[PDB]
Design a binder for this molecule. Sequence first.
Ligand code: OVR
Ligand code: O
Ligand code: SR
Ligand code: SR
Ligand code: V
Length: 327
Amino acid sequence: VSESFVAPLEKRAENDVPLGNDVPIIDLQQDHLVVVQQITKACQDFGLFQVINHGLPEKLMAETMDVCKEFFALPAEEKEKLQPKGEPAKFELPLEQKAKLYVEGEQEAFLYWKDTLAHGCHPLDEELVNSWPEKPATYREVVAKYSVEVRKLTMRILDYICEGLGLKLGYFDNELSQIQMMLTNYYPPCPDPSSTLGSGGHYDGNLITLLQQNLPGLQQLIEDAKWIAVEPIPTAFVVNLGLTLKVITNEKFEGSIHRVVTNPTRDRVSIATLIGPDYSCTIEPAKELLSQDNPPLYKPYSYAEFGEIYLSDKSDYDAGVKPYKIN
Ligand SMILES: CN1[C@H]2C[C@H](OC(=O)[C@H](CO)c3ccccc3)C[C@@H]1[C@@H](O)C2
Ligand SMILES: [O]
Ligand SMILES: [Sr+2]
Ligand SMILES: [Sr+2]
Ligand SMILES: [V+3]
């Protein structure tokens, strides 16, 4: 493996990470109150859960994974059209909603063993969809339907979260969910998995993420610096609560800290829908939940200012919010 991809010793993954048997799997076709209670418990104790019987068509999930795999099978010459000035774009502000291929890493500087296609999805209009990949031919029609369906499911989950917290329904149906970034992640086979990371350990900086996977590689950090493997369920969504939701709930909910490990023999594609605030938003603990017993743990901050730190400073998982901590 190229020196560029060698992770610092302490960040390298151990070869045998155990299955997370305690990852909540939540059936959304249970009675309404049972769903609210199970989602609430998962948000308080874990910050990562899977949803099944979630109402999003299994056929559409399969068609979306197919067209995403088809995109990454495209020739080099086609992929160049998504590389501004001949190279992948960087995860840095301004983060544009037009489709680009991205490189990612940490500044002991190293790169993640990953190619990412990213674009905005909300609101859908001709200008946005015309900025998506031209190939495969069916990408735009399949991913347009997928993005609307994933958003509908995410807003359902945010209203379950509202009921669990005692916030009015639709609390997040505003500026706090107006950006929908779809990240299609491609992990090619890696000759030295013991030295590399597909994705470094992170909170998602946004509000909430729905992740579609069909192969192993996703790992979560739980108490006592233990990593566990998240079982791939091809017809489920992994829900990762973001650092933004951790702040707004005043740490009543956990954020998901997770990473992706490489594989020596086979490639892997994942589809992450990252929903969260516009860069113009002010983030603070929900005042409705604050009291003398529950004082705010964060001062109000600019999401844009947070974003710059979150994307550049990887010294700690919550480096993005450290400047805004109080009490
Ligand atoms: C592994 N990387 C993490 C950081 C970066 O995330 C982003 O780029 C999101 C995209 O919404 C973002 C969130 C909050 C503020 C700025 C950007 C790209 C990817 C994501 O999978 C999460
Ligand atoms: O992510
Ligand atoms: Sr190039
Ligand atoms: Sr175009
Ligand atoms: V993530």
